[PDB]
Amino acid sequence: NPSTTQARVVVDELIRGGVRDVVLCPGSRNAPLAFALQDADRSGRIRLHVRIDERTAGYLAIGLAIGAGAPVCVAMTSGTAVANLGPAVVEANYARVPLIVLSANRPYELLGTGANQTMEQLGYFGTQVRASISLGLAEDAPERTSALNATWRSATCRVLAAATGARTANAGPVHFDIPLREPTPPGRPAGKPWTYTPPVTFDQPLDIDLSVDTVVISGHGAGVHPNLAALPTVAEPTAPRSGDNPLHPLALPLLRPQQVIMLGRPTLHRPVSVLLADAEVPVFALTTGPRWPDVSGNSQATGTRAVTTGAPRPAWLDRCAAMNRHAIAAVREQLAAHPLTTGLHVAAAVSHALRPGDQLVLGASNPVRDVALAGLDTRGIRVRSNRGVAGIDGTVSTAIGAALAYEGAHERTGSPDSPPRTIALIGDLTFVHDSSGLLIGPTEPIPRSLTIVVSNDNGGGIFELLEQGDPRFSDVSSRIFGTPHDVDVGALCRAYHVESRQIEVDELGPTLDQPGAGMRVLEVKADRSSLRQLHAAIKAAL
Amino acid sequence: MNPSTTQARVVVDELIRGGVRDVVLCPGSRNAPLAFALQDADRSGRIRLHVRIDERTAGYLAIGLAIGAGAPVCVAMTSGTAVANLGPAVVEANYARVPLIVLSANRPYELLGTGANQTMEQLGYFGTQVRASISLGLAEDAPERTSALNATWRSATCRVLAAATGARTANAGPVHFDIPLREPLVPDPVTPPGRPAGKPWTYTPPVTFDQPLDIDLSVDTVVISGHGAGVHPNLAALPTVAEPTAPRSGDNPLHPLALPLLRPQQVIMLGRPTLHRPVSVLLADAEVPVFALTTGPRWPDVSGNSQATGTRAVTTGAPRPAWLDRCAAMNRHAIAAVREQLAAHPLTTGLHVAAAVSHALRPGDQLVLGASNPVRDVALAGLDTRGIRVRSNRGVAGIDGTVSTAIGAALAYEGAHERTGSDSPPRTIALIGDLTFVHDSSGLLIGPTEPIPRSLTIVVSNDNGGDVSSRIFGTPHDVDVGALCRAYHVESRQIEVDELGPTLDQPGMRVLEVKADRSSLRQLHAAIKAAL
Amino acid sequence: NPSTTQARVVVDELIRGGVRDVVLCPGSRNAPLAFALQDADRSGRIRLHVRIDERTAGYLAIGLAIGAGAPVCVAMTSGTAVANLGPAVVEANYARVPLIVLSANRPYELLGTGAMEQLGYFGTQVRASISLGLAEDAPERTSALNATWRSATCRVLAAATGARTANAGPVHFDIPLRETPPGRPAGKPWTYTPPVTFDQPLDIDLSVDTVVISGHGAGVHPNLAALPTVAEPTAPRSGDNPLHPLALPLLRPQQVIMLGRPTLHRPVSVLLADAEVPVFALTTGPRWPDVSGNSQATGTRAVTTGAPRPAWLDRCAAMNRHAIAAVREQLAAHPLTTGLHVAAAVSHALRPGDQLVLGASNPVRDVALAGLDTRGIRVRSNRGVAGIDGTVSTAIGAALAYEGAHERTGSPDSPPRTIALIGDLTFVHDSSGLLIGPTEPIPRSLTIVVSNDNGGGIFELLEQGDPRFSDVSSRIFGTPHDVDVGALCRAYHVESRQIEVDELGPTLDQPGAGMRVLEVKADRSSLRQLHAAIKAAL
Numbered sequence A: 001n002p003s004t005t006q007a008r009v010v011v012d013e014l015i016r017g018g019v020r021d022v023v024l025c026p027g028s029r030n031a032p033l034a035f036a037l038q039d040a041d042r043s044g045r046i047r048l049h050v051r052i053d054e055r056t057a058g059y060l061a062i063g064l065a066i067g068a069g070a071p072v073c074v075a076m077t078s079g080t081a082v083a084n085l086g087p088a089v090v091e092a093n094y095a096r097v098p099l100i101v102l103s104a105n106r107p108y109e110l111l112g113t114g115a116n117q118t119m120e121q122l123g124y125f126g127t128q129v130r131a132s133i134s135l136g137l138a139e140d141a142p143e144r145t146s147a148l149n150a151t152w153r154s155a156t157c158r159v160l161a162a163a164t165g166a167r168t169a170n171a172g173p174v175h176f177d178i179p180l181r182e183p184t185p186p187g188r189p190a191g192k193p194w195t196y197t198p199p200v201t202f203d204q205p206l207d208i209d210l211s212v213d214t215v216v217i218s219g220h221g222a223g224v225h226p227n228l229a230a231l232p233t234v235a236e237p238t239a240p241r242s243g244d245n246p247l248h249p250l251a252l253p254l255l256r257p258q259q260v261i262m263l264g265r266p267t268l269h270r271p272v273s274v275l276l277a278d279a280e281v282p283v284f285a286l287t288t289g290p291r292w293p294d295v296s297g298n299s300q301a302t303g304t305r306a307v308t309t310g311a312p313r314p315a316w317l318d319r320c321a322a323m324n325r326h327a328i329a330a331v332r333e334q335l336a337a338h339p340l341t342t343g344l345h346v347a348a349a350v351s352h353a354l355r356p357g358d359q360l361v362l363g364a365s366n367p368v369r370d371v372a373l374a375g376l377d378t379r380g381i382r383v384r385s386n387r388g389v390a391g392i393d394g395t396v397s398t399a400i401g402a403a404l405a406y407e408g409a410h411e412r413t414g415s416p417d418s419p420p421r422t423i424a425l426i427g428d429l430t431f432v433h434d435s436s437g438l439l440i441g442p443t444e445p446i447p448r449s450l451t452i453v454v455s456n457d458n459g460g461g462i463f464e465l466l467e468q469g470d471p472r473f474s475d476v477s478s479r480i481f482g483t484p485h486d487v488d489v490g491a492l493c494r495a496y497h498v499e500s501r502q503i504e505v506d507e508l509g510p511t512l513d514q515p516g517a518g519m520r521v522l523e524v525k526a527d528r529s530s531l532r533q534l535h536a537a538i539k540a541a542l
Numbered sequence B: 001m002n003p004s005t006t007q008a009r010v011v012v013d014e015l016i017r018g019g020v021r022d023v024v025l026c027p028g029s030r031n032a033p034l035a036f037a038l039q040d041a042d043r044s045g046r047i048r049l050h051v052r053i054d055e056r057t058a059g060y061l062a063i064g065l066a067i068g069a070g071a072p073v074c075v076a077m078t079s080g081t082a083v084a085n086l087g088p089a090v091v092e093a094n095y096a097r098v099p100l101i102v103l104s105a106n107r108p109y110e111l112l113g114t115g116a117n118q119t120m121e122q123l124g125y126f127g128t129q130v131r132a133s134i135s136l137g138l139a140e141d142a143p144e145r146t147s148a149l150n151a152t153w154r155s156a157t158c159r160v161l162a163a164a165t166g167a168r169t170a171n172a173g174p175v176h177f178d179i180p181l182r183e184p185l186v187p188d189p190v191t192p193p194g195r196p197a198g199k200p201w202t203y204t205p206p207v208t209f210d211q212p213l214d215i216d217l218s219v220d221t222v223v224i225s226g227h228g229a230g231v232h233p234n235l236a237a238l239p240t241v242a243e244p245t246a247p248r249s250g251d252n253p254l255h256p257l258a259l260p261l262l263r264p265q266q267v268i269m270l271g272r273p274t275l276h277r278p279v280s281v282l283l284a285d286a287e288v289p290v291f292a293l294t295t296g297p298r299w300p301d302v303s304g305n306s307q308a309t310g311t312r313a314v315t316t317g318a319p320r321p322a323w324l325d326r327c328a329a330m331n332r333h334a335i336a337a338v339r340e341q342l343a344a345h346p347l348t349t350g351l352h353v354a355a356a357v358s359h360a361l362r363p364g365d366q367l368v369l370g371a372s373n374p375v376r377d378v379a380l381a382g383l384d385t386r387g388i389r390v391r392s393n394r395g396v397a398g399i400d401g402t403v404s405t406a407i408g409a410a411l412a413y414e415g416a417h418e419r420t421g422s423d424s425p426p427r428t429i430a431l432i433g434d435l436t437f438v439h440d441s442s443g444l445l446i447g448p449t450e451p452i453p454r455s456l457t458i459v460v461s462n463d464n465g466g467d468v469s470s471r472i473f474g475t476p477h478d479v480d481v482g483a484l485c486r487a488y489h490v491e492s493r494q495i496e497v498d499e500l501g502p503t504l505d506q507p508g509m510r511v512l513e514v515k516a517d518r519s520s521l522r523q524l525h526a527a528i529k530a531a532l
Numbered sequence C: 001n002p003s004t005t006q007a008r009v010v011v012d013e014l015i016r017g018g019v020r021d022v023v024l025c026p027g028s029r030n031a032p033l034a035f036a037l038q039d040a041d042r043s044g045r046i047r048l049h050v051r052i053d054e055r056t057a058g059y060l061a062i063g064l065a066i067g068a069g070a071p072v073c074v075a076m077t078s079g080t081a082v083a084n085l086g087p088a089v090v091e092a093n094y095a096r097v098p099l100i101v102l103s104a105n106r107p108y109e110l111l112g113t114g115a116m117e118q119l120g121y122f123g124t125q126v127r128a129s130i131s132l133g134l135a136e137d138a139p140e141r142t143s144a145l146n147a148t149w150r151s152a153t154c155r156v157l158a159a160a161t162g163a164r165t166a167n168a169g170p171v172h173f174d175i176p177l178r179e180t181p182p183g184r185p186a187g188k189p190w191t192y193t194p195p196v197t198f199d200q201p202l203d204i205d206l207s208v209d210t211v212v213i214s215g216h217g218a219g220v221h222p223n224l225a226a227l228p229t230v231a232e233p234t235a236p237r238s239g240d241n242p243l244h245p246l247a248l249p250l251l252r253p254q255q256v257i258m259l260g261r262p263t264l265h266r267p268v269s270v271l272l273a274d275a276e277v278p279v280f281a282l283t284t285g286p287r288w289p290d291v292s293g294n295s296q297a298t299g300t301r302a303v304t305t306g307a308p309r310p311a312w313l314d315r316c317a318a319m320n321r322h323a324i325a326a327v328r329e330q331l332a333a334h335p336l337t338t339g340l341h342v343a344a345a346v347s348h349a350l351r352p353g354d355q356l357v358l359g360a361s362n363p364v365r366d367v368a369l370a371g372l373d374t375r376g377i378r379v380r381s382n383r384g385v386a387g388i389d390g391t392v393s394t395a396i397g398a399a400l401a402y403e404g405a406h407e408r409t410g411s412p413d414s415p416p417r418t419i420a421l422i423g424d425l426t427f428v429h430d431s432s433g434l435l436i437g438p439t440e441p442i443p444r445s446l447t448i449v450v451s452n453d454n455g456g457g458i459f460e461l462l463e464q465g466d467p468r469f470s471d472v473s474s475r476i477f478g479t480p481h482d483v484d485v486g487a488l489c490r491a492y493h494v495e496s497r498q499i500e501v502d503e504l505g506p507t508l509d510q511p512g513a514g515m516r517v518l519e520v521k522a523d524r525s526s527l528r529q530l531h532a533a534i535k536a537a538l
């Protein structure tokens, strides 16, 4: 049949385009390209992942795409599919993740008259996706076989190109529809894609005088700038570090920089937000994509790289280095002097235990910030986190997807060594949010060396550090911002047959040092009633 | 009073004046103005606040809080994916016509495109699924304009309420109410008043929408009522194949299995029939005329031969007594086959659990059903739904948020009984499959400070399971139901089907797990087909 | 062939649904249902109107619908069709006009890879977006495919005419393409939807000093007929106690009954926004308006108790006569001719049975200021968005539909007059609407009166019209054009005559060509001073 010939053409081109992982979910109707995907899965050409939860499936694809950079597909099958994939698609848009959403519309059926179970469309597709491409019904015309193969494969590489940013340098989600009526022509030789897109280089030089007292702030999506490696740099955990001169985030208010070089999209730390908005401080935004950020409209110029003149003052370097030391010492000393265990303690333990080659997945909220407060040195490490829109949803499956993709890349190198560790640090709310992600059937791929560390302070500790955390709200803030839940984390892990251990913070390093089951949850109970005082103590020790 | 605090207090007040009794709130800092105002209202008894951690299942808790007593319910969340997580519950609320107000905080729109953390294309995210997408607008720091802003804010809130409850449309559904807020978000170290006597700012009397239809009841007629069906006393005598969520209008039941063995000459379709393949087969009969009677402007195109649509029937004649006798005999025969075969069958199936739950119920109970096999099994068991309120997310019939809907339906039902001023609160019994229960197991989660249903029992009919995607159903998931309820601190017990009736008679929230077989399920249904 | 059978079925059901007129334009691809449409037009079941301009073809459909209240179709044909139809569809939404936009997607072709050209407005304007689905080659199931195609067409008409929502408006109807089964007996629609009544009573105390403001889309209320009524031109009248809009600022009503959607008169908005005056909104549809959030309640009809004070009735009637007299006396004293003069002339020349089409800007406002009595007159104006675009074709379509309804009576009398009063910018905006091929239907009694003051007169009466802006406001607000109106109508072969104000009544009394343009030169030099003279006399 032509529909079944079409499916095998697309899947073949998708494999040629670098798609190593595809996610599906049971639904009202068959998945798009399901049979072509099943054939390729048994052949090992591609790895399928099945989940019941459509929401966690979308974030599973996010992890499968950020773990090694490959485009990943998700196959919608139901009417709830658009709604449940929404959060992952929005994140894919903002985090610039190549996420291809597969659909299978039926043009012989009625649209707009009732329950459109193929697609219940929301409004987010019009604003989030890089492209909406539909293949058109497969003609029963064997004379056109040569031509239909060319256009199907050209359109499939179009979907891939839009998803990976091959020509735009702005990866993101793409909607790909392959229509169907109810109820293999070859590609290019040597496994090359039908339409090849060579490496694209968007270039936007900016003149910057480095003799002016400059601090670098690198956030999500930041590039590597070897000509900025010497500068003091306040780097977010997901920012690749260009050099060896880190500036602690808490030292920034103890300095007066005269200009700021902003790499990527920063989302963390109020000292960062205040400095970038300072009208007396020129801010140069260097990005890898067409977008650039601003705080209060204070971005003076945008580019992709810097053409640097001069060099930083040694007196400015030495005083930045000294404040960096003061902030590092205030954290470690006040943490040691603190009686109770907080998430900041847990983050410091997780950070001392990381080894080069590791993959670190950071949940939103306090964990991704605490890891920066503990001064983690990310060099030699791959650090992921859904900074696109900073949700606490889907983090478990993002970690599972990242682990599966990172390990698959390692196995592909053919190295004899153990698959590298994926270690995740997530809050307790974040864990409860995506507990469904732990349920993985026996037929489905499971990570070989993933450890999810759950710092559990029975609620959202980050709100103790905001205006609602001031003691004048202790009357009221417990219920509406603390949100305690009393969840038995161990019992939840037992229900999903996930190896689980509850340990105290001193035991975390040793436990992570010794491998265990392929997937496991380490729970370290923490306190958040002392969190605001602890941060106040660090500020007072600065 | 700073602008965000004033605006949030005006809105919450007008929402309460509009009939909102329950509000679901999920944590965040951008929606802190909404949290503080809703908290005050909860503490003075104006509303009952319910806090949840997962925005998606929290939407289904609000849906349950709406279908339980008929009132509009709002769910408030911070900006970002928290809003996007309400998508599933909005799709269900759209089709099930549920007044669900999605009350989202947002960054100022001026920040959209700047790269601000947790900022996205929020307004219009839901598209055509919501009855309206309304933005309040950023609150101006302008004291002399306070009287004016009070009137615009309150009139905009009543528009949200009117679109949600179908006040003028007769088509209730979800509404997106986006509130852009900026610092200061917390109250700084008197609220502009609404109308006197607690009246809403814009009074909208519930409308009466009327489309009479001429139907001759002499012609051999069968009535098929589905979700959203109305009550039609002039149709009470007719043989009625009623979905469990369709309110009965009389006492002439027609079993769904009996319909294909009869030859009706015309069909009166009440509401939107979803459930049974046999009513689907007859609605595709293009030679049999169908009259569609609905309580709202929408009407099902399930039948290709619907001659006319309306709101009520203007009846002529009366049904042939031979025709009434014939169907009544078909109904007794179909129900006899089901009960005879269930007793002959050796193993306990989900259909046995379903029959046991139906026999246990008494008038005044509220029955919540997972929208898969449980509502299909309870219908085949011949449940008599007269006097009991039956709920089910039949809008899209997804497995998301089923536990949260039962919890929400129970809380709203109990609260309605408490305002009667009466006895112990009425029972709410939920019957859910194991796969659906595990899927929305985190919907069990109720924080210690949060309201707990007083009389909700969740019967889990555990048969360990229900294209390449179906390969996950080749193996029983083997998920510990008891460990799940232990994780969410809910009392759970494993019991046998004949214990079920006595356990339910006993006077918080508990789960009753009933192990069941599904290997013999196909053999049991075939024995029912053969006994017909 | 499946698609031609499907096309005939849909057109047949559309005709059974009361569609009498369909507007098409030559297009890059074939029109949806064009072969089925042509046959129906040849047999006289439906009347086709072809234009080249897609924008004014959309407003031609607007007129063909508001002329007799019937659903009208427009057949998209090209990649600019969606962009050109946008204005009329937005107007069809806010004015609640039964507009069915036909498309024909080709599901065997690629989407999103090259050059229907979608914008963002379809999602926010239409009542429904229904796609019929491709017609399968399956003679076994013809009978079922017939019922499915016809019911879906019934669904499109129900959304367009508001047969169940009481909210007519635009509908997107798609019938897909790849490169006759009968309907119901006695011509009945396949799925019949009887008349629906949305009913929302409101208790109102008529003893409270009440005045009625009725705007676009207002319903007819017998039990409000005695009250003073500041009515808009397009609003039907329930009784005969008119209150001049200029009398409103000199009165203190204690409550206002608001009918429909008022858009005219700054004194009206001031009253409706008055926080000490309760405002009851009575509408025929689900929507309701508010000014400054001061709408106290909404409904469909009033349940009245008590009666207005006779002293209150007398002073309002007195204020009406005083405001009427100030306009007519200041007009007589004014030396130069203005649009207000032209408007007053047009209204005195109107008879019962006439159709009056009012352009936006000053014409629709001036007609109310002249105290036109709209009883017996069908008054049309695009008040939904109040654009100055597409008014020439709206008048043409309104005249054709009005005349077509009269002619179906069979009456021996000549078709009733359709008189349109539009400003000059309005006329230049939709000038291309005058170009009609000899094969296309042309009205027989349309007269387009163009009050030409060589720019936008309404801006003389606003804040930018204050003399302190005299230096700069003429170029950016007056926008003079020096267009030879007579030459342009000559180019399109339209009968046209420039006439003076007192020539208007006599020239409208005797018919001429089926379509003609009566231009009356007018003045905005003195428009502000004229309106100051009227306010001073009040």
Ligand SMILES: C=C(O[C@H]1C=C[C@H]([C@@](O)(CCC(=O)O)c2sc(CCOP(=O)(O)OP(=O)(O)O)c(C)[n+]2Cc2c[nH]c(C)nc2=N)[C@@H](C(=O)O)[C@@H]1O)C(=O)O
Pocket (backbone or CB within 6 Å): A270, A343, A363, A364, A365, A366, A367, A390, A391, A392, A393, A426, A427, A428, A429, A430, A431, A455, A457, A459, A460, A461, A462, A463, A466, B026, B027, B028, B029, B030, B031, B055, B078, B079, B080, B081, B082, B085, B117, B118
């Ligand atoms: C950091 C600040 O505020 C942020 C602090 C909290 C929330 C936040 O956005 C943080 C996200 C981030 O930037 O990483 C969080 S943390 C947070 C608590 C997480 O608790 P945890 O136990 O997992 O971690 P922790 O207790 O902090 O260790 C919540 C609820 N929320 C709100 C939220 C709601 N729903 C969804 C789907 N995603 C969400 N992010 C944000 C908000 O709600 O507006 C807020 O912008 C600040 O003002 O400086």
Ligand SMILES: C=C(O[C@H]1C=C[C@H]([C@@](O)(CCC(=O)O)c2sc(CCOP(=O)(O)OP(=O)(O)O)c(C)[n+]2Cc2c[nH]c(C)nc2=N)[C@@H](C(=O)O)[C@@H]1O)C(=O)O
Pocket (backbone or CB within 6 Å): C266, C339, C359, C360, C361, C362, C363, C386, C387, C388, C389, C422, C423, C424, C425, C426, C427, C451, C453, C455, C456, C457, C458, C459, C462
């Ligand atoms: C009436 C007031 O302000 C209005 C003043 C005029 C414009 C208006 O909207 C009025 C339309 C109406 O309500 O009838 C006009 S009058 C107007 C002048 C018409 O001149 P005319 O020669 O046809 O008539 P006139 O000379 O006044 O008799 C123009 C240009 N425009 C703007 C306009 C631009 N483009 C399109 C497609 N449609 C438009 N309506 C409106 C505006 O642009 O904001 C504005 O709402 C007021 O403040 O009371």
Ligand SMILES: O=C(O)c1cc(O)c2ccccc2c1O
Pocket (backbone or CB within 6 Å): A093, A094, A095, A096, A220, A221, A222, A264, A265, A287, A288, A289, A291, A292, A293, A388, B113, B114, B115, B116
């Ligand atoms: O640099 C990036 O990766 C990046 C990513 C984004 O999603 C942005 C969204 C808005 C504005 C700027 C953005 C940006 O600079």
Ligand SMILES: O=C(O)c1cc(O)c2ccccc2c1O
Pocket (backbone or CB within 6 Å): A113, A114, A115, B094, B095, B096, B097, B227, B228, B229, B271, B272, B294, B295, B296, B298, B299, B300, B301
């Ligand atoms: O009767 C109802 O309540 C109802 C509700 C709906 O959500 C519908 C959706 C599509 C088609 C028909 C529908 C319908 O008849």
Ligand SMILES: O=C(O)c1cc(O)c2ccccc2c1O
Pocket (backbone or CB within 6 Å): C093, C094, C095, C096, C216, C217, C218, C260, C261, C283, C284, C285, C287, C288, C289, C384
């Ligand atoms: O009464 C009408 O016809 C009408 C029409 C509209 O387009 C409206 C739009 C917004 C608000 C009220 C509206 C309204 O009352």
Ligand SMILES: [Mg+2]
Pocket (backbone or CB within 6 Å): A427, A428, A429, A455, A456, A457, A458, A459, A460, A461
């Ligand atoms: Mg926490």
Ligand SMILES: [Mg+2]
Pocket (backbone or CB within 6 Å): C423, C424, C425, C451, C452, C453, C454, C455, C456, C457
């Ligand atoms: Mg003019």
